[PDB]
Design a protein around this ligand. Structure first.
Ligand code: F6P
Ligand code: F6P
Ligand code: F6P
Ligand code: F6P
Ligand code: MG
Ligand code: MG
Ligand code: MG
Ligand code: MG
Ligand code: MG
Ligand code: MG
Ligand code: MG
Ligand code: MG
Ligand code: MG
Ligand code: MG
Ligand code: MG
Ligand code: MG
Lengths: 329, 329, 329, 329
C-alpha cells in the first residue's frame, strides 16, 4: 500500500521517545525472525515430518516434541545474536541460559518456545510466549535475575500460529496486534491499543476436571450455565492451547481459567513463561489476572519452573469469580 | 523430494481403476484451487481488511461475513468451470444453483464455503466443507437432486485452515489427508487410509447449553467427569469450529456432540453441507455418526437448509451414548 | 478475483473440444507441478546451497550442475506418474527413458530440464523447455519414437524462471502465456493467443564468435549496425539463456541467432529439446525458425542429442537473413 | 537451520564496532522492507496488471511505468519513516525530496527505484539501486547535500529481482551478498566479502551503437573478438538491465560498458543513482570504474540528474581499455 506500519518501525518510534540503547528493538526484531521461521515450519509440519516426540522429558514432565526442539533452538540463537540479552529462561531447559560475555545485553527473557503441545498433531492453533525483564542486579548474571515478579515486566506477549499468524505485543503503554504478511514477511499493525470488554459472554476451562475443582470454580461454572437473573447462559470455548484461548479472550472478552485443583496445588500453567506474560498482556489491556487469591503479577517466584493457577479476562467476570473465592475463604 | 504424491495424482489413480469420465478429478481439482485461494486470503485477512459483516442474513439466520462471500464466490465459480457439476447447494444461497447447460456435468455438490464463523476474528481455525453426489434423476436438474440421503455420497470431506492447511478426503474406499505445501501450492498426501481409534479420551460439546440438554446428554457428560469404574475422566475440548473439532476427533479419537436441545428440536448444524459430509468421513474412517435416534447418513432430507442433531466419533464412545438414549426412550 | 482462468482449466476446455483420453491434461498438469517445484528451489538456490557442479559430464559435454540433477529428477518422476507418457528424452540422460508398462501413455516428451546453465550463479533468468509428440509406431516404445521431425509436435513450450515465473504453451491453435501466482501456486492466463510482430528492432546473438561466423551472419550483423536506408540501427540484446532471449523475442519481436559457425557445423543448441520446441512456439506465434538453409521443424533427427543452427523471430527479420544466405549460396 | 545470519544482524555487528546512532541499521532495515515489497509485486506483475505506462515523462526523458511509480512510493515512504534520512534523490522526481523535520536523520540517499525498464515486460531481471551519503553541511538540508562525489559514499548497493532476489551491499570494509528467503522474508548472507577476478572473459556492451562509438571502444571490441595473442575471444553478454549486467560482472568477472557515444557526450546512465553506487560496489570489490578519462567516484556532480559514461569490471580488463583511450588521447 506503500506506507507500511511494521512492528519494526512501530518499535523504534515508541522507544524513540525514551532515548534508549535501542537494544529492545534489536531484541524484538530478532524475536520476529524466530517467529517467522517457526510460523513457516509449522504451516508445513506434516510435509517436513515435524510431528512426533523428540525422545526426552523436560523439567516439568512434558513429553518433548520435534517442534519444541526446533522452535527452542531458533529462539535461543536469535536472542543471543541480538546482543540484547544476558539470561534466557525456557520451558525446555533445566536451567537458565547465561549468555556468553561478548553477546550480553541488559535483558532477561522468559519464554515458552512452542505452547499448545496437545494441539500440534490435529492442526489446532499453537503459539510462542515471552516476557522480557531488565536486569536489576549488579552481580554477574544468573538464574536469580529471572526470579522477579511479573509487575517488573518491560515487554510481554505472544505469537499465535492460527488461521493467520499474529504477534501480540504488550509494553508499558498498551497492547498492539501485528499480523504477519506471508508475502513480504513483515509484521503489520492491525489492532492498535487493544482493550478487552468490561464484561464477556464466554467461559473457557477444561471441564474434564470437574471432580478435582474447588467449590469456588464449581459454583462459578454452575452460575455460567444457570444464571441467577435468568440472563442468557455463557457460551463455552476451550481450544486447549493457552495462546489461542487467551487471544480469543482478549478480542471477544470473557474469562479463561486453569485453576488450582485437588490434584495440583499450583495448577498446571508455568509462572515465568506462561502465566506472567499472559497476565501482563491482560492487565495492559484493562483486564485482570489472579490465582483466585492474589494477583499473578505480584508473585515473587522461587523456582524458574514453578506453576501457578491462573484466571484471567474481563475485569467484571474475573471479579465475580474472586468474590466467590472470598465468599468461600 | 522429487517424487511427490499430490492429491491430483492420487485421484487419477484411484478413479483410474474404474474407468471414468474423469470429471470427478476435474471437480476435486477445481475445489483445491478454491481451497488454496481461501487459505491464502485467510492467512492475511486482517491485513486485507477481510474481517467484518457483509450486511445480510442467510436462510438459516447467520450474520454473513466478508469471508463467507469471498469463499462462496470462489467455490461457485471453480465448480461451474470444472464442467463436472449440474446442481450446487451452499449455505449462503437461498436456493440451489442450477449450472448453465454448456458447463453441466453429472455431479451435485453441497458445501459450506467457510465454516467456523464465530472463530474468524480471533484467528481460531476455520474451514470449508463439501459433499458430492452423482445425479440420480433423468429430469432436468433441480433442487430435488440435492435431496438425497448421505449414504448416496460418492465423495466428501473438508479443508481445515489451521496451523497448517489440510484437505481431508473421504471416498468409497477410505479417508486420506493431504497437507497444502505453501511453497508449491500442491496438496501432499500425509496420512493414508486413516482410521479413528475404537475408543477415545476426549469429549467435545458446548456445555453452555447445559440447561437445555436432554437427560441422555446430561447423564453422558456427568459420566465423562465422574467415571463409574473410577477410570480417569475424559478431557474436554471444544474449539468451536466444527471442522477443527471433528478433525481432532478423527486424529486423536473421542466424541463430538451438537445435540438437539430443548430450544432446537433439530440441533444447529446443517444436514446437507455440515452433518452428512462429516458423518461420511467418520463412517469411512470406522467411526459412527448419529442424531441420538438414527444414523445421520440415512435421513432423507426434505429441505436443503434443514438442521440435524449430530454425535460423531469413535464407535465405542458414540455407542455408549446411544445406549443412554435407548435407556431413556 | 474469484474467477480464475488457470492453465489447468484452459487445457480441459481446449482438448474438451476434441473429445480425448484427457491424458494430455494430466501430462501438462504434472509438468506444472515439476515447474513450481523448480521455480521454488531456484528462488532460494543460494540459501539451499544448490549452485555448484554435480560432478559429471552429459552426452553433449556439459559440466552438470546440482540444479540440472534436481530439476531432471523432478521432471522424470512427474512425467511417469502422469500415466501419459511412454518415452522421455532429456538433455541429462545418455539414452531415451522407456516408461515401465503400468505407467505408459501415448506421449513422447523431449525436454531440457534446466536451460541457461551459464546464468545460474549470477542469478540471470533460466528455464525449462519441452516438446510433446504422440507415439506414431505400433512397435514397443523405443528411442525411435523420439526421432520425429518438429512438425509432428502436438504441444511445445517452456517455463521461464525470470523476475516472475511464466509458462508459455504452444498447441495446434496458438500460443498462450500463463504466469505463476506464488500465493496460490496456480498458472494464470495472462496473454492470450500471442502473435509476434512482423518486424522487430532487436538482434540477439553472441558476438564473441565474430571470428568464426559465416559471411551471411557477418553481413547481417553489419547491416543491423549500419542500416543501408539510414534507419535507426537495431538494439542488441543477449541475455545468454535461450529461454530468456527467445521469450523477449516473442514479446517485443526481433531476431535470435545461434548459427552454425566455423567451429560447429551444427551450431550448439540441441534439436530435440531446445530447437524444435522454440521453433514450434515461434511458428504458432506467426514467426519463423530456420538453420539458414531449411526449416528447423522439417529436420528428421537421426540422434536424440544432435545439434542444429537456429535463427528465429519475426518473419521479416528472419527472411532478410535467409535472403543473405541465398545470396551467398 | 536455527542460526540465521540475516542482513539485519550483520549490520548491527558491523556498525556495532563504531559505536553509532544505529540509524544506518534502521535505514538499511527499512530499505529491505521496500525491497521485499517490490520483489513480491514484481513476481506477480502480470497477474496484478502492473506492466504498462503510468502516463508521464521523468526529468531525463524516460517513459514512466506503473512499477516505477509503485517502487518509488515504496522507497520514499520507508526511507522517511526510518528517521535516518534528510534528503532523498530519485530518478522519478524532478527535485530532491527534503524530509519533514520530525523525521530527519543524518543521511542522504540517492536511488533508482526500479532499474531495467526495457526488461520489465519480457520478464528479464530488473532491480533497485541506491547510494547513501552522510550529510556534510550545517545548512538546512537541500539538494546541495546530494551533490557530493561518489568517494564520499558510506554505503551503496542494489537489489536484483532475478531468478532469486539478491541484496548486494557495499560498505567501507567490503561487499556482501544476501539472498532473500521467500518463506521467512529475511535477507540471508550467502557471499561474504566478495572480490572480483583480476581478469575476466566476458564483455558486456550494447553493440547496436557501433556507428556512434568512439575509436577507443571500437578498437577494444575488435580486440575482444580477434585477440592479438590468439587467445580465446571473450564471450559477449548484455542482458540490458544495468543491475543484472553489473551483478554477473561482479560474480564471474569481466567488463561492462555504457560509454559516451557520438550522440551522447555523457553516456546514458545516471551518475547519482546508477553510476556511483555501481562504481562504489566495484571498487569495494577490488575492481575499477571509469568514464574512459577519469574515475567515476571523483566526479563532483553539478546536477542531480546528470549522466556519465561508465566502464567497470575486473581491474585488468578496465585497465586495458583505459590504455586504449590514453593511446588515442
Ligand atoms: O489439557 P489441559 O489440562 O486442559 O491443558 C491445556 C493447557 O496445556 C497447555 O498445553 C500447556 O501445557 C496450554 O497451552 C493449555 O492451556
Ligand atoms: O457456538 P455454538 O452454538 O457452540 O456453535 C458452534 C458451531 O457453530 C458453527 O460455527 C457453525 O455455525 C460450527 O462450526 C460450530 O460447531
Ligand atoms: O555462451 P553461448 O555460446 O553464447 O551459449 C548460450 C546458450 O547456451 C545455452 O546455455 C544452452 O547451453 C542456452 O541457454 C544459451 O542460448
Ligand atoms: O537499451 P540500452 O541503450 O542498451 O540501455 C540499457 C540500459 O538502460 C537502463 O535500462 C537504464 O535506463 C539500464 O538498466 C541498462 O543498462
Ligand atoms: Mg511442554
Ligand atoms: Mg505452554
Ligand atoms: Mg511449550
Ligand atoms: Mg454461517
Ligand atoms: Mg458451518
Ligand atoms: Mg459457513
Ligand atoms: Mg547443459
Ligand atoms: Mg538448454
Ligand atoms: Mg539444460
Ligand atoms: Mg527510467
Ligand atoms: Mg536505471
Ligand atoms: Mg529506474
Amino acid at each position: 500500500d506503500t506506507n507500511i506500519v511494521t512492528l519494526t518501525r512501530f518499535v523504534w518510534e515508541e522507544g524513540r521517545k525514551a532515548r534508549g540503547t535501542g537494544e529492545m528493538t534489536q531484541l524484538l526484531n530478532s524475536l520476529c525472525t524466530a517467529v517467522k521461521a517457526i510460523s513457516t515450519a509449522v504451516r508445513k509440519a506434516g510435509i517436513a515430518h515435524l510431528y512426533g516426540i523428540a525422545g526426552s522429558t523436560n523439567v516439568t514432565g512434558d513429553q518433548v516434541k520435534k517442534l519444541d526442539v526446533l522452535s527452542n533452538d531458533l529462539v535461543i540463537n536469535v536472542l543471543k545474536s541480538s546482543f540484547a540479552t544476558c539470561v534466557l529462561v525456557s520451558e525446555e531447559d533445566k536451567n537458565a541460559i547465561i549468555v556468553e560475555p561478548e553477546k550480553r545485553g541488559k535483558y532477561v527473557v522468559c519464554f515458552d518456545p512452542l505452547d499448545g503441545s496437545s494441539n500440534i498433531d490435529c492442526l489446532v492453533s499453537i503459539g510462542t510466549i515471552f516476557g522480557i525483564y531488565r536486569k536489576n542486579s549488579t552481580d554477574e548474571p544468573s538464574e536469580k535475575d529471572a526470579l522477579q515478579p511479573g509487575r517488573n515486566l518491560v515487554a510481554a506477549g505472544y505469537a499465535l500460529y492460527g488461521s493467520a499468524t499474529m504477534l501480540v505485543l504488550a509494553m508499558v503503554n498498551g497492547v498492539n496486534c501485528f499480523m504477519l504478511d506471508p508475502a513480504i514477511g513483515e509484521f503489520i499493525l492491525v489492532d492498535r491499543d487493544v482493550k478487552i470488554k468490561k464484561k464477556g459472554s464466554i467461559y473457557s476451562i477444561n471441564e474434564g476436571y470437574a471432580k478435582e475443582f474447588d467449590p469456588a470454580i464449581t459454583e462459578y461454572i454452575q452460575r455460567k450455565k444457570f444464571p441467577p437473573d435468568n440472563s442468557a447462559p455463557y457460551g463455552a470455548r476451550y481450544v486447549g492451547s493457552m495462546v489461542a484461548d487467551v487471544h480469543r479472550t482478549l478480542v471477544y472478552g470473557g474469562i479463561f481459567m486453569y485453576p488450582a485443583n485437588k490434584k495440583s496445588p499450583k495448577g498446571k500453567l508455568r509462572l515465568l513463561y506462561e502465566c506472567n506474560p499472559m497476565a501482563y498482556v491482560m492487565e495492559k489491556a484493562g483486564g485482570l489476572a489472579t490465582t483466585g487469591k492474589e494477583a499473578v503479577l505480584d508473585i515473587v517466584p522461587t523456582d524458574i519452573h514453578q506453576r501457578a493457577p491462573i484466571i484471567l479476562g474481563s475485569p467484571e467476570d474475573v471479579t465475580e469469580l474472586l468474590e466467590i473465592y472470598q465468599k468461600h475463604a
